[PDB]
From a paper:
Peptides destined for display are first delivered into the endoplasmic reticulum (ER) by the transporter associated with antigen processing (TAP). TAP is a heteromeric ATP-binding cassette (ABC) transporter comprising two subunits, TAP1 and TAP2. Each subunit has an N-terminal transmembrane domain (TMD0) that interacts with other components of the larger peptide-loading complex, a six-transmembrane helical domain (TMD) that forms the translocation pathway, and a nucleotide-binding domain (NBD) that hydrolyzes ATP. In this study, we analyzed the structure of TAP in the presence and absence of peptides. These structures show that TAP suspends peptides across its transmembrane cavity, anchoring their termini in two distal binding pockets primarily through their backbone atoms.
We determined the cryo-EM structures of TAP in the absence of peptide (apo) and presence of six different peptides between seven and 14 residues long. In the absence of b27, TAP hydrolyzed ATP at a specific turnover rate of 2 per minute. All structures exhibit similar NBD-separated conformations in which the peptide-translocation pathway is open to the cytoplasm. NBD separation is greatest in the apo structure (53 Å), and reduced in the presence of peptides to between 35 Å (for the 14-mer peptide) and 27 Å (for the 8-mer peptide). Comparison of the different structures of TAP reveals varying degrees of NBD separation, indicating that the two halves of the transporter can move relative to the central axis.
Author numbering:
A (entry chain A): 173 to 484, 492 to 741
B (entry chain B): 131 to 681
Write the structure that this text describes.
Amino acid sequence: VRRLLGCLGSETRRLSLFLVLVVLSSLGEMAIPFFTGRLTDWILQDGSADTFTRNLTLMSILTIASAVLEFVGDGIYNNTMGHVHSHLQGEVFGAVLRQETEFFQQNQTGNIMSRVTEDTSTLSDSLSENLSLFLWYLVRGLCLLGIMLWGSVSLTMVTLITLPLLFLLPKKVGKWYQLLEVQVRESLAKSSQVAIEALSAMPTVRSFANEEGEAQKFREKLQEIKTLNQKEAVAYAVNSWTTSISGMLLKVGILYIGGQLVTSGAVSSGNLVTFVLYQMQFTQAVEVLLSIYPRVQKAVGSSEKIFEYLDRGLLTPLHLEGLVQFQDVSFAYPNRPDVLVLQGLTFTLRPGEVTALVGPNGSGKSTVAALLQNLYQPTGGQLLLDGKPLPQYEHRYLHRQVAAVGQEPQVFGRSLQENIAYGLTQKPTMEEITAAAVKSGAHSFISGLPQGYDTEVDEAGSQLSGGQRQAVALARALIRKPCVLILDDATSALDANSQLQVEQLLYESPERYSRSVLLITQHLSLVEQADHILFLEGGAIREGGTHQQLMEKKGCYWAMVQ
Amino acid sequence: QVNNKVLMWRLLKLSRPDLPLLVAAFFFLVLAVLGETLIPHYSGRVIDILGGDFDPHAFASAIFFMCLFSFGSSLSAGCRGGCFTYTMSRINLRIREQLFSSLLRQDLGFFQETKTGELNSRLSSDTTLMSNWLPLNANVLLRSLVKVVGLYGFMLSISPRLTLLSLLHMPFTIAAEKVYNTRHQEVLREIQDAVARAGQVVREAVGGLQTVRSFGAEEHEVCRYKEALEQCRQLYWRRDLERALYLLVRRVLHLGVQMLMLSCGLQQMQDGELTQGSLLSFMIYQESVGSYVQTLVYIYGDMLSNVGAAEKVFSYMDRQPNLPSPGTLAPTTLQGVVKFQDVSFAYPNRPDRPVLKGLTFTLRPGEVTALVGPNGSGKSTVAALLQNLYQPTGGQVLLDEKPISQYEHCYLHSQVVSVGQEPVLFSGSVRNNIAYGLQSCEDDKVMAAAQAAHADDFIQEMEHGIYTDVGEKGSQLAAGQKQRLAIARALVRDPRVLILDEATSALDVQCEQALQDWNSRGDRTVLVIAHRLQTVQRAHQILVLQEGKLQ
């Protein structure tokens, strides 16, 4: 549709020059048969050597210039359309990465974004060659016809009228062959199905000793298919015969009408020779050009789906107050709106404090974590970050102000000195990076590598341990220096030293006074040491207070602890 | 590379019976090629006739000869195409039948090792791909060679000097093609490496977009992708640029020889050793010969590339079965006594897990036998080696003081039958399923077993008696119907050793009691496997089986 024209319109300034070059090249190449016929008539007319060598030099110059202009035009068009292909790939990747978490909540869909862009790439690539080829021959074909119209209209009318009779008759004939091929393939599939049915039941057929029976049944099916094979052979023979005689008999008629014209004195023999050569070249060009339309059609059909897929706050505070509050905060996943992970939860995390969530697994802690990070908006209620809405804050400001380590953080597939600072707009200092590594306890893991922090880390954390991965995630979080930290699974499976460092950074760190931290993990020792311990189950808060207060209240937290 | 050579030799040996069809196709192709190339020669003759003084008789004769030769060439081409298609179809049918007949002889372990879907894919695709090899490749090679020979013969007939000036052009074209192919492959490897590197970052992004959105923003990913694209784009342009340059060189080379040839031809026009029509026909031949002379060198490269599909099917056909030597014993009198002596068996697919350790028991004709205990579902492995579906790893199992492997394959199963725990039915008729494994039996001998198996109740109800149809692997019948049909299938053969696998556990116990009181349990050995001791009310000798051991 108009989408392809709109996306190609950026290069019109060079595409018009490309069209000028392509028509110049098409005009230049066809000088060989014309001069061949003219010089043959000239030498049969006892011509002069001066009028000769001039024509030889002129034809050589014209053909060389045509080849050079064709090369230059091809280079220009390839440059422009490769540029537009790269731009389209970048734009479609940006669009597919700009989709919301609701569209990407299905991890099993992770295949198709892995494919689509790649397919888009080769789609353009295919279309690229096709478009050029088609347009090339189109202009060439037209140019040939023009000179043929300048040769003899009364004879080129014959080769214009004949062409549908030789280009549509094979298309009409081949339907019979295609239908017979379809029937043959269906019968072959049925026979193979019978063979597979016999093959899958080997225990019982060997228990009854009936291999010869199954062989006989397969032979019977093949004997049934033999007749369809015979009819297929006959149809293909007829199609080959008609597609040969349609093009072969025209070369007789053109020479007959040319002989009639030449005897009539309308044209000379050299004009007939030039025509014959031009008709051969024109037939070749039209024959190739008619073979490009279905591929272009399937390419644009896939591009329509590609573009259909393409179709589907700015608050910047200077400092963070570290206040988080909820007002009837309920959240529901888009895939399962009938079941709400949280139902009007009410929990507050003041600056310089710790909130420890205790409850059954799957109660909706991840929903609260996503709501606090503005990844997905809640189904109900309002989440206030220091009295302001979470989605109202800008994405960069919220990401640089409130930071967290997920339940299953993944090490970035880059260098450890880069994977510990992924997404940082400003590059951290070397001393700052060393301090961040030392503070989080990741200094021991980083120093163990032969190349230090600059050593590359493979995909999916192959070269990094799980405790090392947790240490790297906590180091990235600490290097972010966020005021809001959702410590989720920070040291659940890590070493005791890592857990002690996490507890010291949560409680005894100098920055803990001006930083708000909410903890959702299995650290039992750190759970009892929190300033506030809240019990959440089924999306609702059942208990809240200190560990001693929770134990004295005999609530859900007391039962879980005991 | 000798693997592809022996695969081609095997394909030729397979297609050896199709020699007359291939000979006819070759003759028709020779006729078509020799008739097609005459038309430019007669075009030259017609153009020569038109010049000078007119002569209607010669013109009419040349046109009539043109029409006749064109019609003959078209007919020969059609016949050649039909013959090639038919021999391809015959090759496909023969290879499919041979592959199925070879695959039917393998043991149970081969079928347990491999997958049914893989065999379906091979039988449905690789046979067709193998059959498409010889006719298409032979047609391309022979057409190219005969066309090249005919065109060069005609060109040498027209003028030898122009033919030499044309032949001078070929080595430069071949060298340029080789150099361009080498450089194009060299840049294509780097293109593939760059596109893999560019796909790596999008793979990482789609794998960890959650952590991407958690810490930072998408731009630090997206821009990275753009950088990779830039590298890729540069490489793309390089490849395309080289291709364009190569094309220009070829084009220039073509013009070169064309110009030179034209000049030389016109020189002969001054000498009277040529004519206008001869020059036109030579131009046509020179234009035509290039594609054929290139295909003549590309056919060998394409052949070894395309022959690589045939290795899987031929490997499947050439796998030697591990079954023992076929037996020859076939006595018309059977005592029906079966005894086991210190037999130990393990699955060859998963060895070093002995499911049997020196089992020993003796059956009797007039005495029934029962096996109880789940055995970790280890009961079904003692019935399988009773029907010679497996060979014992230790000890030996014998029937009438002869090893069971010495009996004929089509006779031992005819005398010793078993019912499966899961009755398996075939897509044919009900009479076909009941009389399964029997090459010819009278229809009356069919419903007698159904009456004996309590399956005659729905025989009368369902239309056409027993000549009805069922769905593939059983679709209309229920579990009890399948069990009764399997029991009748076992009963119709009048066996000597009847192995029952929990007959009353699924169907009614009355059917099991009737089977124990039937003709196949009158003076014949019967072994019944049960998951409970409820069969002990009729059983004579009962053996429990736990942990792969007897009582």
